Design a binder for this molecule. Structure first.
Ligand SMILES: Nc1nc2c([nH]c(=O)n2[C@H]2C[C@H](O)[C@@H](COP(=O)(O)OP(=O)(O)OP(=O)(O)O)O2)c(=O)[nH]1
Ligand code: NA
Ligand code: NA
Length: 156
């Protein structure tokens, strides 16, 4: 069996738009995404998600809601990425560019799927329907999915 490392992913989803950030360097650079990163020792997953949102987008929220979990496996990488996905609709400041991310709002009929991780085409629609989900995706490199599972769940 493989070990996994905890990561977070945060989507600010409002009734007509979603906040994404263009990843400027590092993992997933060049793709629009939610905000997030590695959970640190001692913090809850939700608190790590709140922290990453603030660090990468400038937004401070008091509460996030867990909407899904996605496990990523890469060919040649023994460690799995266990990504805990959170949403909120409620913000009260403006996003600001960070070293990691350039935030930008997208209308919900203009989700930039071609410039997002390929797996997002499968699970993001569930997030938009306010459904909860568990997923797993195995990648060869950055572009090619070799195997995946996706299921709606009632509890994440
Ligand atoms: N939408 C989407 N997000 C993904 C996928 N794979 C994946 O790791 N993520 C998310 C989880 C995290 O938010 C981010 C990966 O973490 P990261 O490398 O940015 O972590 P970090 O901020 O701690 O890294 P760093 O600043 O130290 O370089 O990308 C995917 O296929 N789709
Ligand atoms: Na980060
Ligand atoms: Na990050």
């Amino acid at each position: 069996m493989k070990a996994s490392r905890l990561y977070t992913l945060v989507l600010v989803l409002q009734p007509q738009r979603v906040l994404l950030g263009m990843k400027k360097r590092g993992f997933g650079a060049g793709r629009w995404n939610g905000f997030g990163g590695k959970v640190q020792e001692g913090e809850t997953i939700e608190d790590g998600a709140r922290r990453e949102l603030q660090e990468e987008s400038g937004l401070t929220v008091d509460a996030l809601h867990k909407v899904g979990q996605i496990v990523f496996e890469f060919v040649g990488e023994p460690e799995l990425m266990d990504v805990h996905v959170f949403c909120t609709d409620s913000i009260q400041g403006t996003p600001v560019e960070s070293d990691e991310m350039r935030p930008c709002w997208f209308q919900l009929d203009q989700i930039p799927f071609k410039d997002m991780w390929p797996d997002d085409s499968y699970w993001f629609p569930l997030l938009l329907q306010k459904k909860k989900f568990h997923g797993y995706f195995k990648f060869q490199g950055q572009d090619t999915i070799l195997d995946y599972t996706l299921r709606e769940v009632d509890t994440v």
